[PDB]
Amino acid sequence: SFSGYLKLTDNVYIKNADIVEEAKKVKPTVVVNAANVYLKHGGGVAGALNKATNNAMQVESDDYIATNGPLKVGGSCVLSGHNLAKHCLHVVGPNVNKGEDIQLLKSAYENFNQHEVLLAPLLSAGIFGADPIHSLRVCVDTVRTNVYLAVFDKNLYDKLVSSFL
């Protein structure tokens, strides 16, 4: 199971870790991807997870988009987890660098409540442009299921833990 996590609340845990490396080690039932509406896994967590699947995640995603069209900002879809997890929950947090409504971050986190336990990154953090301290606050106040947060950057991890109310 998950190891080396700091408990933040009854159901939220956090660790300074590469989510690709965490997923390969634990092989969780669900790994969350920081997806965009087109499931174009170019950079950030999405690019890293996709590269770990040898592009199989992108091939599957393109077939999903061809059939279903794009996701909504705040929405999600469950696809295969490939070599990383049983499933990948592709969740679209608002991208602040695209002028997307930050209030959609709570809607994005609500998707996590459909899964008993998840390995996840902070939604809308990193290249999505939102304040990661705000993302962690929305996470703890929205997610009721067990969420194991992987924060890649050590310096951001320390800031998140030390400022956690």
Ligand X SMILES: Nc1cnc2n[nH]cc2c1
Q: Which two tokens stand for residue 41?
A: 């896994």
Interface pick for ligand X out of 14, 23, 37, 45 (rule CB under 6 A): 45
The Cα–Cα gap between 133 and 75 comes to 21
Binding flag, residue 150, ligand X (CB under 6 A) = yes
Map residues 16-35 to x or -, x wherever contact with ligand X holds by CB under 6 A: --xxx---------------
Please, are residues 105 and 130 in contact by the beta-carbon 8 Å criterion?
yes
Map residues 100-129 to x or -, x wherever contact with ligand X holds by CB under 6 A: ---------------------x----x---
Nearer to ligand X, 48 or 108 (CB): 48
Residue reference for tokens 């080396």? 4
Q: Which two tokens stand for residue 152?
A: 């890649």
The Cα–Cα gap between 124 and 121 comes to 9
Contacting residues toward ligand X, per CB under 6 A: 18-20, 44-45, 48, 121, 126, 150-152
